[PDB]
Enzyme design. Structure first.
Site, PDB file in Angstrom:
ATOM      1  N   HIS C  58      36.572  75.645  20.810  1.00  0.00           N
ATOM      2  CA  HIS C  58      35.267  76.030  20.281  1.00  0.00           C
ATOM      3  C   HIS C  58      35.387  76.701  18.923  1.00  0.00           C
ATOM      4  CE1 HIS C  58      33.620  74.782  23.963  1.00  0.00           C
ATOM      5  NE2 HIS C  58      32.674  75.694  24.104  1.00  0.00           N
ATOM      6  N   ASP C 198      35.481  67.146  14.402  1.00  0.00           N
ATOM      7  CA  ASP C 198      35.142  65.860  14.987  1.00  0.00           C
ATOM      8  C   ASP C 198      33.789  65.393  14.465  1.00  0.00           C
ATOM      9  OD1 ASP C 198      33.626  67.908  16.185  1.00  0.00           O
ATOM     10  OD2 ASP C 198      33.789  67.108  18.204  1.00  0.00           O
ATOM     11  N   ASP C 200      30.160  65.012  15.590  1.00  0.00           N
ATOM     12  CA  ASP C 200      29.251  65.375  16.664  1.00  0.00           C
ATOM     13  C   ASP C 200      27.953  64.585  16.615  1.00  0.00           C
ATOM     14  OD1 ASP C 200      29.853  68.780  17.767  1.00  0.00           O
ATOM     15  OD2 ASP C 200      31.282  67.292  17.045  1.00  0.00           O
ATOM     16  N   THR C 253      28.045  67.234  28.959  1.00  0.00           N
ATOM     17  CA  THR C 253      27.195  66.500  29.875  1.00  0.00           C
ATOM     18  C   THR C 253      26.900  65.200  29.154  1.00  0.00           C
ATOM     19  OG1 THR C 253      26.211  68.372  31.033  1.00  0.00           O
ATOM     20  CG2 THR C 253      24.926  66.338  30.909  1.00  0.00           C
ATOM     21  N   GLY C 283      29.440  64.793  24.555  1.00  0.00           N
ATOM     22  CA  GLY C 283      28.077  64.314  24.669  1.00  0.00           C
ATOM     23  C   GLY C 283      27.229  64.627  23.454  1.00  0.00           C
ATOM     24  N   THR C 284      25.975  64.206  23.515  1.00  0.00           N
ATOM     25  CA  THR C 284      25.041  64.418  22.426  1.00  0.00           C
ATOM     26  C   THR C 284      24.486  65.840  22.446  1.00  0.00           C
ATOM     27  OG1 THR C 284      23.302  63.475  23.832  1.00  0.00           O
ATOM     28  CG2 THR C 284      24.380  62.002  22.276  1.00  0.00           C
TER      29      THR C 284
HETATM   30  N1  LIG Z   1      27.262  67.282  25.156  1.00  0.00           N
HETATM   31  C1  LIG Z   1      27.530  68.584  25.220  1.00  0.00           C
HETATM   32  N2  LIG Z   1      27.634  69.203  26.430  1.00  0.00           N
HETATM   33  C2  LIG Z   1      27.902  70.513  26.474  1.00  0.00           C
HETATM   34  N3  LIG Z   1      28.093  71.352  25.431  1.00  0.00           N
HETATM   35  C3  LIG Z   1      27.981  70.689  24.219  1.00  0.00           C
HETATM   36  C4  LIG Z   1      27.712  69.359  24.031  1.00  0.00           C
HETATM   37  N4  LIG Z   1      27.673  69.035  22.688  1.00  0.00           N
HETATM   38  C5  LIG Z   1      27.916  70.175  22.113  1.00  0.00           C
HETATM   39  N5  LIG Z   1      28.115  71.220  22.969  1.00  0.00           N
HETATM   40  C6  LIG Z   1      28.396  72.635  22.672  1.00  0.00           C
HETATM   41  O1  LIG Z   1      28.212  72.885  21.262  1.00  0.00           O
HETATM   42  C7  LIG Z   1      29.425  73.399  20.675  1.00  0.00           C
HETATM   43  C8  LIG Z   1      29.496  72.945  19.247  1.00  0.00           C
HETATM   44  O2  LIG Z   1      30.517  71.949  19.135  1.00  0.00           O
HETATM   45  P1  LIG Z   1      31.858  72.192  18.386  1.00  0.00           P
HETATM   46  O3  LIG Z   1      32.713  71.018  18.604  1.00  0.00           O
HETATM   47  O4  LIG Z   1      32.381  73.537  18.736  1.00  0.00           O
HETATM   48  O5  LIG Z   1      31.354  72.134  16.924  1.00  0.00           O
HETATM   49  P2  LIG Z   1      31.584  71.255  15.695  1.00  0.00           P
HETATM   50  O6  LIG Z   1      30.394  70.374  15.601  1.00  0.00           O
HETATM   51  O7  LIG Z   1      32.891  70.640  15.676  1.00  0.00           O
HETATM   52  O8  LIG Z   1      31.459  72.404  14.513  1.00  0.00           O
HETATM   53  P3  LIG Z   1      32.538  72.968  13.458  1.00  0.00           P
HETATM   54  O9  LIG Z   1      32.601  71.898  12.448  1.00  0.00           O
HETATM   55  O10 LIG Z   1      33.772  73.148  14.253  1.00  0.00           O
HETATM   56  O11 LIG Z   1      31.828  74.162  13.045  1.00  0.00           O
HETATM   57  C9  LIG Z   1      30.528  72.924  21.600  1.00  0.00           C
HETATM   58  C10 LIG Z   1      29.859  72.997  22.942  1.00  0.00           C
HETATM   59  O12 LIG Z   1      29.868  74.299  23.528  1.00  0.00           O
HETATM   60 YB   LIG Z   2      32.309  68.898  18.138  1.00  0.00          YB
END
Ligand SMILES: Nc1ncnc2c1ncn2[C@@H]1O[C@H](COP(=O)(O)OP(=O)(O)OP(=O)(O)O)C[C@H]1O
Ligand SMILES: [Yb+3]
Ligand SMILES: Nc1ncnc2c1ncn2[C@@H]1O[C@H](COP(=O)(O)OP(=O)(O)OP(=O)(O)O)C[C@H]1O
Ligand SMILES: Nc1ncnc2c1ncn2[C@@H]1O[C@H](COP(=O)(O)OP(=O)(O)OP(=O)(O)O)C[C@H]1O
Ligand SMILES: [Ca+2]
Ligand SMILES: [Ca+2]
Ligand SMILES: [Ca+2]
Ligand SMILES: [Ca+2]
Ligand SMILES: [Ca+2]
Ligand SMILES: [Ca+2]
Ligand SMILES: [Yb+3]
Ligand SMILES: [Yb+3]
Lengths: 143, 485, 465, 503, 143, 143
Positions: C58, C198, C200, C253, C283-284
């Site tokens: 995270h 990654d 997202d 999820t 997930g989204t």
């Molecule tokens: N599909 C999902 N199910 C559950 N939690 C999710 C989902 N998508 C995102 N999240 C939540 O949102 C958080 C944000 O994703 P994260 O991978 O930490 O960020 P990021 O988009 O890579 O941002 P940075 O570029 O690292 O700032 C990770 C997770 O706790």
């Molecule tokens: Yb991410």
């Protein structure tokens, strides 16, 4: 900790052709045995006869999870032991050698012969590699 | 060879009062034991020398290292070194708040009294400077300057009482804003009068030599152990003597968590200083840092006084780690590092790393039974063959003390592959939480390294094909023996 | 007023080649692909094949300084520089990833290769220069317009270190001489490889036509082939292979269909030459109900292989309603929206119809008992469409004064009243549309309620006529 | 003389609407009660006067005192007066969010609109400056400048909606940055229409004259109490009434935690401003600050309207306390200070000190069998817990000399049965009774210092004991008169010694 | 859990002629039809026969709670339903149209006649407003 | 509370030489009263046979908690009374004097004579200081 119980739970899920988790005293040992514990086969009697004398002989969970709450109050030296192991292992290679065992014994006032410590190490060595590691040191110390 | 400070130069960096350190030398020599102190607020050293009382665990307020209160424990934690950190200050005030309440009568607060002498010390210390006079409500007050732009200080002329207030515009970390108010300092009760508090020497560690520990063991329990027919029951009873009189620690009511020999040490230390004239009572008030498991402190400069009465001061956490290894830990001296290291400290959530030899070998040794389960429970946080938890329980079978190394190895190499199999099949419920796939995939490697080690000790993917698929039979162990020969 | 083409890309952070490779999927699968912002300083790293962090990490990526593009162990070197509490929370997460996932995730020293330095020179992030000499080693101070940290990089191995400029103290009460910049890394065949940001997915909009495909042709006919209760078929059918999501193990999820769509996206990047492995791990956002992320810009790839970038939340909403939620495509929004997200306590607003048009109703001495609150009576499927709006209006007026005109009963506080009074106003329009459909204060006097409903039932039934 | 502001000057600093203040002089004078107000957001005064609705406990968002939204309750609490404070602003927004959700329909958020007049008041107040004309995507706005260094502002010409965004290069305490977006304010649902909220008049306290609370007592129970025999019943009966109609207060559904006469004083105050024209509703939405035990608020300046209709305003906490001590708690007026004072408020962990006469005399006061056995409870929290018997490790002992006899000899000091005796009798018997529980403790300090400083607690009781003993003695003619007593014999052989020594 | 139970302590009072919150199987099916349910006469005793090994006729709240306990299991899938509704409503007006439902259908591979559609809407329709709102739409699956 | 409930169970072990924390009804009053209460010999026998009916009539902690958790619900007035005391104490010395009593009395309408007033003071006065301190004021107002 809550993990502690989370562990004991893992025991049931393993061997429990009962479902709800009500193993009897016929497999009770099959639990603590494969879960770091070596209590006498006798104490298993009176205990599973006091908190478990309902006339069914079915150990649900509290009858276990709760009964368990006892041993880990005195012999919980799990920490101290791991601490002591590090004391012997002077070179810090993860294992206790005959040589190391000597120093600790020597310094504590007990002079030993290079033949004895090897007798001591061999007696403590379970996998037969000539050295004692934490696991073995626990076995040697717990059992 | 490690770039570390020594003697005078190391002393001046310790924060410890010279005469006190000089006194500690005798003690370290006298009981061949390394005495390692954590840092001491430099701006507290004189306070201490002066004879100002030190603080116990009933006062978690942080000491100040700036402003006219430098050295004391300000009631208002923003004046302390933890200045700025809105949270540390809040937790500080909360602690200070509890100290006043929860210990009503024993711990209190009082107006800072900067007398003529402290002023000079602070001047030389480059902390504050007495400025232009100024009357108020018929009273004399000299403004005390400082490189701090949030507050402004002043001191009376009748009672030398210091007062502070927010500098117009600027806002206190907590968001406050006030005018001329006294600077209150944490204090303890002494025969009825409230006396100011300063920092206490905090032990980072106490590493006594095993020879020093023996003395702790009663000349009976030891003799009983030493004189035992069995070799194992002896060895064990020997370690227990070590644990009970050396490693074992207990929670004290006011000295924190420390062992009994450590308690003696403290007394000795405080007795030592009191003799050199100190009159503020104890200067060492609680166990070593290695027991501060809840709120571990990773300090860069540890002051060390080795058994030779010499002074050493490590420069960085790694250097401190080296020194302990090459001079204490692997050199016949009882030592234990904070249990919270290599883990996330419960209280402050700190992650202080330390070299644990046991983990170095985790790679080659195969897990026990409880280690298999205690990894199915702690692993069941981010989320039916019990034969594995059994096989491992067989590999570490304390009944092997009749067999021989030649034998042990043989059956261990087997009992092991038994698991490397009952684990290889588990990796065949198509899949299951892929976070478990790696555990076994790792455990397999952990079993490979173990067996393939017991083999180079005598004679892995090869000897495996000598499979004993056989559903249920010891005949397996038979063809096994045949492979080696 | 969005952005398109190479321009929307130059702001999406996504790597072109991968972006390009995504069009193919957008068209083929005929669905909308919407992404959240992707750390720009990490876009080149992804291209170079660096691994992307999954839900096991995270930590916050960084968008400044040397560590730019990676997940710093020391969160105060991440995009959250400053923000004392931000830094900390991140740090704790790194620590958890490092401990709770031992062997899987870890941290390694930061080594900016030769190319990377060049890149950061273009982005004007850092500038290599003056040589240094301390413990007998050759270091080059890496220059940065930062005032808090002073960096440098080894020449012997290319490692980056960092301390704090002259008496310049950092956020979390710290200060320290030349250290070493650690970075979150994953375990790849025994070796630790540093991680990056990654891709997202904000959301995925699949054409219903595609959601059908998802459905098993045999199981669909079971309720579609004139069994006629048929609607309930196609719905409870659309729900499963379309709506229903389920917690995964590495992806938060997600829905079965989505997992597939996912793999396609990853596979798609491979054909490009991306070694790092997957680049879409969870997930989204629409399923991120724990810690919702409200991003100003959302890179969108329509099934026509086009690139569209939103400029603000309000704008993204319009596009989603104008082309997706209102264009036969399957969509749904983060259930936490218009509510206080349980995790980060975020209140993200989103247009929600069931409220937009919320002018309706629903959950001796006889008044509390009886039919005075069952407006919705299933046994209304037989009553002629006319009698419907006829008996309906009544059921409404029936509740006009169910036990409502108890307003001035005594002292009945502000919502209850303002609500029963509002609820009244609702029933008003709810009944208005009925009358107005084909016809209250147009003539509510002809509605005198003193006698039981069974009485006026006749009077009223003719009043409207 | 207490350096407190008076008249106009105090009023200006008060924050209350001048008219409202005057309109209160009536209730103060009439009902012979002291009225005390906590500071009122100076930028809210003109909003209140203008009839802007005030916020109740269902809205905890903090009010703003700067920028175009000054005086209002901004949804984005970083625009509140808590601007900059990362934690405050957080507790702020989260509180505003629960208000919109938990009390949905009753509390909401609307865009801020600064009418022609308000903008003027702000220029004079030197808060914002009407800037230049800007055109953005068709709409036309005028910039609103403020010495802020994190936010840029502007107002619409079409609807007067004010907008704000982060300045270029700048960042928000929450770590945010965004472009032009309407500034939202906390509104209440007034007759189906959402109306913006502003600061209320939070009462710091109310000191009614004792004679005034008398009227609160039904002229019957006051009778059934006065017309009785035993004075010990008459006085005890009166006291309990005082508590009933004056001291006791209970938590209300909305007003928070006020008493009944207080609820009246409120209704009064609200109605008084209604007369002046206030079209916003109530101006006082909840009980006094003395009943805010969870999140007490220490305000430097407290505005005061005495029963003489005069205006006062203390400059600092210490001064408030003095004023209250000399003109209220020392001049026959009902008064009680916040219970969390001198304690650690449960919510905000505030530790607000306040002079408690009781304590001031706890020095020369013998403890109680309860004010003892209870101290021996908490002093047991700073130690484990298992078996009081055999407190040590040695099982060769399991008692202490004069263990419980201490508590007993304590309550024996406070025996109601002493009314049948004379002062002199009580003094003597008490003085002796004092030296009794003293000796029993004196002895417990002569065995083993068992616990670190339980001895600190006993060296304390003896401290108080002595003071009391000396006290009673100083009414006729300690250690000196203590060595004349022997406590190695028995109760029936010691008492028969002290009886003479006294004389 | 709160919202998970407060859903009973807010309705188990408007229909009860007993000053102690203790009702009977009489309104058993009355409260339920007021809480959203719509069980048939048949489905009342058949369930209060197993879990209710008492059968006294007088049921209070403690029994009422334990009842609808595991009842709201798969039937609590309202979430997906609500999101399903938003899929039909293309214009997000809050109601479903014929051109809408037809559209949705003519997209899922099931070509419906311009006649059958209008039939469906009217099926679940209760107001006759030629539309279906969530309040109504939900009824479609609640039954 | 953590303290309120930690006092009763605390004073319980002040006179119970039996280990099983089974105090007698005779030493009960010496406990139930050695602390903030002074009930009549009635309750000592009125509730000693209600919650305590195991034969002998002994009392344990759980039982003591039951009793204390009873007539210790309205005794919360401790707060109000305290505040009340502060009202009488005009000069704020911590004691109520024979002259402040006259004030509170007269101002409350009840006019009294020096004879009467001085009598009430003495009535509540216990140590004979000539005034009423809080402690005194408390008993006289509760007991
Ligand atoms: N599909 C999902 N199910 C559950 N939690 C999710 C989902 N998508 C995102 N999240 C939540 O949102 C958080 C944000 O994703 P994260 O991978 O930490 O960020 P990021 O988009 O890579 O941002 P940075 O570029 O690292 O700032 C990770 C997770 O706790
Ligand atoms: Yb991410
Ligand atoms: N042996 C111990 N057992 C339990 N807690 C301990 C022990 N040693 C240290 N601690 C914990 O660490 C805390 C740090 O000690 P403290 O006395 O507050 O600091 P200090 O070293 O005096 O620093 P300042 O000079 O006040 O900054 C106090 C206590 O919670
Ligand atoms: N009588 C009372 N009973 C209970 N809580 C009270 C009482 N008086 C005040 N409080 C508590 O103190 C809080 C402070 O009031 P609040 O309305 O938030 O402040 P305010 O005086 O309007 O200040 P701002 O101008 O908004 O900063 C509200 C409530 O939680
Ligand atoms: Ca070794
Ligand atoms: Ca071995
Ligand atoms: Ca529609
Ligand atoms: Ca309809
Ligand atoms: Ca007095
Ligand atoms: Ca007295
Ligand atoms: Yb310390
Ligand atoms: Yb307020």
């Amino acid at each position: 900790t809550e993990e502690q119980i989370a562990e004991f739970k893992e025991a049931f899920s393993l061997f429990d052709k009962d479902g709800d988790g009500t193993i009897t005293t016929k497999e009770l040992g099959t639990v603590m045995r494969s879960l770091g514990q070596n209590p006498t086969e006798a104490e298993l009697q009176d205990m599973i006869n006091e908190v478990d004398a309902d006339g069914n002989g079915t150990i649900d969970f509290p009858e276990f999870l709760t009964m368990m709450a006892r041993k880990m109050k005195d012999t919980d030296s799990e920490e101290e032991i791991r601490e002591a192991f590090r004391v012997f292992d002077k070179d810090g290679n993860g294992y206790i050698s005959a040589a190391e065992l000597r120093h600790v014994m020597t310094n504590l006032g007990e002079k030993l012969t290079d033949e004895e410590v090897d007798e001591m190490i061999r007696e403590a060595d379970i996998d037969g590699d000539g050295q004692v590691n934490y696991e073995e040191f626990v076995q040697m110390m717990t059992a | 060879r490690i770039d570390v400070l020594k003697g005078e130069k190391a002393l001046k960096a310790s924060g410890l009062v010279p005469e006190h350190a000089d006194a500690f030398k005798k003690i370290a020599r006298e009981l061949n034991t390394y005495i390692l102190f954590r840092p001491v607020n430099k701006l507290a050293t004189n306070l201490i020398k002066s004879g100002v009382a030190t603080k116990g665990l009933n006062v978690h307020g942080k000491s100040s290292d700036w402003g006219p209160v430098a050295g004391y424990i300000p009631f208002d934690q923003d004046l302390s070194k933890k200045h700025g950190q809105q949270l540390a200050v809040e937790k500080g005030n909360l602690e200070n708040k509890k100290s006043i309440t929860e210990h009503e009568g024993e711990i209190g607060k009082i107006p800072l009294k900067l007398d003529h002498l402290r002023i000079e010390e602070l001047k030389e210390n480059g902390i504050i400077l007495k400025g232009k006079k100024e009357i108020d409500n018929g009273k004399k007050y000299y403004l005390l300057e400082s490189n701090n732009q949030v507050y402004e200080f002043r001191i009376s002329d009748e009672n030398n009482e210091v007062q502070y207030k927010t500098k117009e515009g600027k806002i206190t970390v907590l968001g406050e804003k006030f005018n001329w108010r006294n600077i209150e300092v944490m204090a303890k009760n002494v025969e009825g009068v409230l006396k100011p508090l300063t920092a206490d020497y905090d032990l980072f560690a106490l590493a006594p030599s095993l020879t020093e520990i023996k003395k702790q063991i009663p000349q009976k329990e030891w003799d009983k152990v030493v004189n035992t027919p069995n070799s194992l029951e002896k060895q064990k009873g020997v370690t227990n003597l070590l644990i009970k009189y050396g490693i074992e620690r207990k929670p004290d009511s006011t000295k924190g968590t420390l062992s009994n020999w450590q308690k003696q040490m403290l007394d000795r230390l405080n007795e030592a200083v009191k003799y050199t004239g100190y009159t503020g009572g104890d200067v060492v008030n609680h166990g070593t840092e290695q027991d501060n498991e809840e709120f571990p402190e990773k300090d860069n400069e540890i002051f060390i006084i080795n058994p030779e009465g010499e002074f050493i001061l490590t420069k960085n956490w790694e250097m401190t780690g080296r020194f302990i290894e090459k001079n204490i830990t692997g050199k016949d001296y009882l030592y234990y590092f904070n249990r919270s290291y290599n883990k996330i400290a419960p209280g402050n959530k700190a992650y202080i790393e330390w070299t644990d030899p046991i983990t170095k070998a985790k790679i080659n040794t195969i897990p026990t039974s409880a280690e298999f389960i205690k990894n199915l429970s702690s692993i069941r946080r981010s989320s039916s063959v019990k034969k594995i938890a059994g096989y491992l329980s067989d590999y570490y079978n304390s009944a092997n003390h009749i067999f021989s190394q030649e034998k042990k190895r043989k059956i261990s190499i087997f009992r092991g592959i038994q698991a490397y199999n009952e684990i290889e099949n588990v990796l065949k419920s198509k899949q299951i939480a892929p976070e478990y796939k790696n555990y076994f995939q790792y455990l397999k490697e952990r079993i490979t390294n173990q067996v393939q080690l017991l083999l180079t000790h005598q004679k892995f993917k090869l000897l495996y094909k000598q499979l004993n698929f056989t559903e249920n039979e010891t005949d397996n162990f038979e063809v096994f023996q045949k492979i080696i020969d």
